[PDB]
Write a protein that holds these residues in place. Structure first.
Motif, PDB file in Angstrom:
ATOM      1  N   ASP A 257       0.798  -1.171  -0.031  1.00  0.00           N
ATOM      2  CA  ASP A 257       0.150   0.069   0.071  1.00  0.00           C
ATOM      3  C   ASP A 257       0.787   1.259  -0.005  1.00  0.00           C
ATOM      4  O   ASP A 257       1.976   1.079   0.695  1.00  0.00           O
ATOM      5  CB  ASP A 257      -0.882  -0.047   1.344  1.00  0.00           C
ATOM      6  N   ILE A 258       0.376   2.220  -0.927  1.00  0.00           N
ATOM      7  CA  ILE A 258       1.059   3.407  -0.760  1.00  0.00           C
ATOM      8  C   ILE A 258       0.234   4.260   0.280  1.00  0.00           C
ATOM      9  O   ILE A 258      -0.783   4.573   0.287  1.00  0.00           O
ATOM     10  CB  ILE A 258       0.928   4.129  -2.150  1.00  0.00           C
ATOM     11  N   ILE A 259       0.920   4.742   1.448  1.00  0.00           N
ATOM     12  CA  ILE A 259       0.513   5.349   2.601  1.00  0.00           C
ATOM     13  C   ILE A 259       0.268   6.952   2.429  1.00  0.00           C
ATOM     14  O   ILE A 259       1.386   7.376   1.588  1.00  0.00           O
ATOM     15  CB  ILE A 259       1.046   5.163   3.759  1.00  0.00           C
ATOM     16  N   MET A 260      -0.760   7.398   2.608  1.00  0.00           N
ATOM     17  CA  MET A 260      -0.927   8.787   2.233  1.00  0.00           C
ATOM     18  C   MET A 260      -2.583   9.112   2.745  1.00  0.00           C
ATOM     19  O   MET A 260      -3.124   8.098   2.175  1.00  0.00           O
ATOM     20  CB  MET A 260      -0.811   9.165   0.925  1.00  0.00           C
ATOM     21  N   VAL A 265       0.675  13.589  -0.181  1.00  0.00           N
ATOM     22  CA  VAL A 265       1.939  13.123   0.198  1.00  0.00           C
ATOM     23  C   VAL A 265       2.240  11.684   0.297  1.00  0.00           C
ATOM     24  O   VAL A 265       1.455  11.038  -0.453  1.00  0.00           O
ATOM     25  CB  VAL A 265       2.497  13.985   1.382  1.00  0.00           C
ATOM     26  N   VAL A 266       3.291  11.131   1.197  1.00  0.00           N
ATOM     27  CA  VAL A 266       3.458   9.709   0.798  1.00  0.00           C
ATOM     28  C   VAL A 266       4.010   8.790   2.129  1.00  0.00           C
ATOM     29  O   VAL A 266       4.198   9.416   3.250  1.00  0.00           O
ATOM     30  CB  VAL A 266       3.915   9.024  -0.416  1.00  0.00           C
ATOM     31  N   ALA A 275       8.050   2.530   5.328  1.00  0.00           N
ATOM     32  CA  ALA A 275       9.164   3.357   5.195  1.00  0.00           C
ATOM     33  C   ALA A 275       8.579   4.984   4.590  1.00  0.00           C
ATOM     34  O   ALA A 275       7.791   4.815   3.992  1.00  0.00           O
ATOM     35  CB  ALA A 275      10.316   2.746   4.263  1.00  0.00           C
ATOM     36  N   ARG A 276       9.341   5.803   5.493  1.00  0.00           N
ATOM     37  CA  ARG A 276       8.889   7.180   5.044  1.00  0.00           C
ATOM     38  C   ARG A 276       9.678   7.710   3.956  1.00  0.00           C
ATOM     39  O   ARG A 276      10.684   7.242   3.631  1.00  0.00           O
ATOM     40  CB  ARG A 276       8.776   8.078   6.518  1.00  0.00           C
ATOM     41  N   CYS A 277       8.967   8.699   3.256  1.00  0.00           N
ATOM     42  CA  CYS A 277       9.777   9.346   2.080  1.00  0.00           C
ATOM     43  C   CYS A 277       8.858  10.544   1.760  1.00  0.00           C
ATOM     44  O   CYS A 277       7.745  10.768   2.183  1.00  0.00           O
ATOM     45  CB  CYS A 277       9.576   8.602   0.796  1.00  0.00           C
TER      46      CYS A 277
END
Length: 430
Positions: A257-260, A265-266, A275-277
């Motif tokens: 999953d693409i967190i946001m 943002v993401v 992992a944060r970016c």
């Protein structure tokens, strides 16, 4: 994975690898992932001949006559680089060129009236071309000298033309060049895909033809470059480049999953871990809901045991068929490489024909090109859908790339990389 990264890249296709490298060189902490067990995404290379037959559901393996299977490296989406083009400069910037070996493409051809001819870009070649008649040749020779002397800083080199207002149509008229010469000049020299340039200021077209001439390369070969061992060498070289900077490449790693949420943002979650970016780069297959279908392309890979006729026994070549010469709304392209670029077994050639699908019988649309290659040993048909982003990345910070079109050179791929870089950094790649 680490707790945080500056950028996370999903997919190892050509666009993504190039953008990734630029970011590392620019001092960013990057994580590069791919759900597939191999490099390349859609633009992957089939390393053993046995595997290609498998991927195409042909239970009969390669025949005895194909030679040593390990000596084949079949790119699924082959494209050539214009020697002095912008993509090559992007490669120089990162320095991946330290890992690649380039070999010039032997010839450049164009289809006109049922036959192929060499593309003339110099006055000497113009006078020798079988493409035009005695008088038109001469007019064409004048045209090239005009393009060769043009200097946008010196108004005397113009010839009463206003570079910023006079259309290219008027320029073709000024030299009295017919439709058939226009077809091959716009399409095989300036490299346009459509005829929209006709009604636009002439300057751009003048610089494009200049680029082709300047990319020259001695012996009178062509302005195109192709890497020894094929395009598969690019994902490999970049992976090696990331290691120098302390970057991370990871294969066979699914994305859950693409967190946001709110301001988009993401962040990314893989096998439970998160992992944060700050920014994310990816190809269309990772964000189905932020993309639209732009069409389809057909690509037929043909194995041959003979060079294409009407070429001077060229070991590699580019062939362009303008849409107008075959009553279509999109060009047909054919590029060929062989054992000379170390991608085929001794004495074998690989020719790939491609175009955008327009009818309900995509395989029939490519007949014009296949006829040029005729005694074909084996054919592998492949149809792909093309996707383009709905989201530009402003706000969201998700930067998606476009699918690869049917063209056999890097122009449009380079345009995409630049657009994305602009949206990301907020300035143009200088």
């Amino acid at each position: 994975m680490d707790e945080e990264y500056d950028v996370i890249v999903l997919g190892t296709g050509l666009t993504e690898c190039i953008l990734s490298g630029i970011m590392s060189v620019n001092g960013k902490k990057v994580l590069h992932m791919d759900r597939n067990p191999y490099y390349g995404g859609e633009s992957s290379s089939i390393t053993p001949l046995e595997e290609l037959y498998k991927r195409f559901q042909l239970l009969e393996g390669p025949p005895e006559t194909m030679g040593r299977g390990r000596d084949w490296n079949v790119d699924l989406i082959p494209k050539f680089l214009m020697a002095n083009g912008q993509l090559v400069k992007m490669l120089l910037y990162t320095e991946v060129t330290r890992y690649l070996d380039f070999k010039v493409v032997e010839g450049s051809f164009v289809y006109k009236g049922g036959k192929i001819y060499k593309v003339p870009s110099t006055e000497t070649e113009a006078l020798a071309s079988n493409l035009m008649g005695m008088f038109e040749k001469r007019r064409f020779r004048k045209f090239l000298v005009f393009v060769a002397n043009f200097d946008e800083n010196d108004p005397k080199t113009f010839e009463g033309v206003d570079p910023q207002n006079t259309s290219m149509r008027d320029v073709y008229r000024k030299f009295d060049l017919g439709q058939d010469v226009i077809d091959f000049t716009g399409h095989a020299l300036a490299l346009y895909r459509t005829d929209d340039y006709l009604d636009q200021p002439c300057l751009e077209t003048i610089n494009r033809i200049k680029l082709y001439s300047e990319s020259l390369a001695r012996y009178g070969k062509s302005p195109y470059l192709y890497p020894l061992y094929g395009l598969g060498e690019l994902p490999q070289g970049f992976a090696r480049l990331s290691a120098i900077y302390g970057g991370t490449y990871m294969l066979n790693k699914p994305v859950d999953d693409i967190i946001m949420e709110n301001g988009k943002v993401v962040g990314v979650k893989s096998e439970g871990e998160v992992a944060r970016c700050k920014q994310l780069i990816c190809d269309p297959s990772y964000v189905p809901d932020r993309v639209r279908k732009a069409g389809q392309v057909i690509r037929i890979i043909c194995i041959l045991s003979h060079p294409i006729k009407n070429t001077n026994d060229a070991n590699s070549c580019q062939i362009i068929i303008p849409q107008n010469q075959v009553n279509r709304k999109s060009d047909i392209y054919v590029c060929m490489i062989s054992y000379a670029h170390n991608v085929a077994a001794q004495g074998k050639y690989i020719a790939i024909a491609s175009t955008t699908v327009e009818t309900t019988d995509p395989e029939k649309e490519v007949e014009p090109a296949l006829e040029l290659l005729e005694p074909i040993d084996q054919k592998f048909v492949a149809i792909s859908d093309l996707y383009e982003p709905i989201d530009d990345g402003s706000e969201s910070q998700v930067f998606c790339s476009c699918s690869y079109d049917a063209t056999t050179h890097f122009e449009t791929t380079c345009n995409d990389i630049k657009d994305i870089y602009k949206r990301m950094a907020g300035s143009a790649f200088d």
